[PDB]
Amino acid sequence: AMVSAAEVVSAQENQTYTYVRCWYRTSHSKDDAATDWKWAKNQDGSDFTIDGYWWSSVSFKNMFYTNTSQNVIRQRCEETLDLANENADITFFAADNRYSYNHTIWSNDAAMQPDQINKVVALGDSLSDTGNIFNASQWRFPNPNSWFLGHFSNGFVWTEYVAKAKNLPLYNWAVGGAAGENQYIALTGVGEQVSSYLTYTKLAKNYNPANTLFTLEFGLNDFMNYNRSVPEVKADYAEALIRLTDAGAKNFMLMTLPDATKAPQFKYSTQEEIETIRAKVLKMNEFIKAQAMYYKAQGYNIALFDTHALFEKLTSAPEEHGFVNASDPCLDINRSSSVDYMYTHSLRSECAASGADKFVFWDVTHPTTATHRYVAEKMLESSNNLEEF
Numbered sequence: 001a002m003v004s005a006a007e008v009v010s011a012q013e014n015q016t017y018t019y020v021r022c023w024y025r026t027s028h029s030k031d032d033a034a035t036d037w038k039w040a041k042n043q044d045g046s047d048f049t050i051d052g053y054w055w056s057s058v059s060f061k062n063m064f065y066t067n068t069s070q071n072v073i074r075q076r077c078e079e080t081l082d083l084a085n086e087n088a089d090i091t092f093f094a095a096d097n098r099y100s101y102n103h104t105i106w107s108n109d110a111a112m113q114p115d116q117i118n119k120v121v122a123l124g125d126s127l128s129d130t131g132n133i134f135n136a137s138q139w140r141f142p143n144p145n146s147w148f149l150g151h152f153s154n155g156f157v158w159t160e161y162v163a164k165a166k167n168l169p170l171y172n173w174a175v176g177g178a179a180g181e182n183q184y185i186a187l188t189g190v191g192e193q194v195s196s197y198l199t200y201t202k203l204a205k206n207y208n209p210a211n212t213l214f215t216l217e218f219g220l221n222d223f224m225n226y227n228r229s230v231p232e233v234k235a236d237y238a239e240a241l242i243r244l245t246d247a248g249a250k251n252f253m254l255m256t257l258p259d260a261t262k263a264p265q266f267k268y269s270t271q272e273e274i275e276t277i278r279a280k281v282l283k284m285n286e287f288i289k290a291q292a293m294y295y296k297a298q299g300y301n302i303a304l305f306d307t308h309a310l311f312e313k314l315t316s317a318p319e320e321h322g323f324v325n326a327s328d329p330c331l332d333i334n335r336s337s338s339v340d341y342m343y344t345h346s347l348r349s350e351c352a353a354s355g356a357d358k359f360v361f362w363d364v365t366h367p368t369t370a371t372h373r374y375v376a377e378k379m380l381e382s383s384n385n386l387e388e389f
């Protein structure tokens with residue numbers, strides 16, 4: 001059950017209103033991660049409010065549920081900000097006042113919604129995190145001048161590009177560990193993300209899990225940062241799919257893990273450490289393929305994308321895929337230290353010259369937003385353009 005029927009009505013009946021914080025990239029260039037915000041307004045200059053209710057689990061992470069669509073909220077932010085910026089990369093959150101954190105807005109579905117995907121729910125690590133650590137860090141980590149508003153990149157991540165391409169809302173539960181995230185948030189495991197998804201969606205109105213597209217990418221955090229065994233990670237991944245499918249999930253975007261040892265931070269790792277992580281990645285990838293087929297044989301809608309194979313091609317011949325550099329970070333970071341996520345960094349000369357869209361990597365671990373877009377686009381075109389969904 002997760003949340004009783006009595007708890008749900010009582011929370012949904014506690015109707016109020018809140019304001020919308022409209023965030024945007026201050027620069028026209030994706031080389032500049034810096035952002036700012038304005039309160040959403042109506043065309044007449046009056047305050048834009050959204051009606052609805054608040055709810056938090058014992059996690060105390062507060063979500064605002066509204067009947068107002070994400071399109072209406074986005075449109076209000078676009079018209080309030082009135083930018084001539086194709087790279088404004090607008091994101092929005094519920095907030096009562098200047099002291100409020102960035103709260104995710106859940107737009108409740110209509111009761112008579114058609115049988116079609118109408119939202120994306122992402123589970124995973126820093127490859128899918130859109131800002132889950134950022135409030136906990138008091139908006140200081142990752143430093144908002146060199147990392148795009150709580151994203152471990154210079155812009156949107158792959159899930160945001162997939163959701164945007166299909167004009168769908170994206171609800172994120174993802175959080176990584178390679179940047180020292182676990183110094184700010186406790187429960188970052190895939191199991192905790194599934195539990196959180198199952199708890200917050202009980203509060204939603206007219207929620208049909210069959211209309212959700214689930215994205216899942218997990219294992220690199222475990223292998224890179226916690227030296228977890230392949231069977232431990234295999235079991236957690238199988239458990240996430242068992243739990244989601246038992247809870248009505250029908251549509252999944254699954255991916256093999258890219259070989260993370262090709263990231264710049266492994267220039268500073270020993271051969272032994274690299275060989276260990278690479279071997280674990282290869283074993284996990286055969287298991288992901290077996291899991292994808294297992295659920296596909298049962299009638300579930302599964303899109304399996306071989307990110308590992310795409311990334312081997314991208315890093316061996318960047319010049320064949322729209323990139324100039326696949327070996328160095330775009331930022332001038334020449335060591336692997338988690339403290340670097342606390343400061344502003346200049347772009348290295350080579351990246352300043354080519355632009356961030358020509359580099360595979362943003363920092364020593366994380367890909368640029370151009371790489372994220374490249375994977376999202378390759379995924380969208382794959383499996384005869386999502387014929388399964």
Ligand SMILES: CCCCCCCC/C=C\CCCCCCCC(=O)O
Binds near residue numbers: 177179224225259375
């Ligand atoms: C899912 C889309 C991925 C697209 C870009 C490919 C990324 C490959 C490079 C490095 C992989 C590891 C980087 C992120 C760290 C994951 C673990 C963590 O968050 O702690």
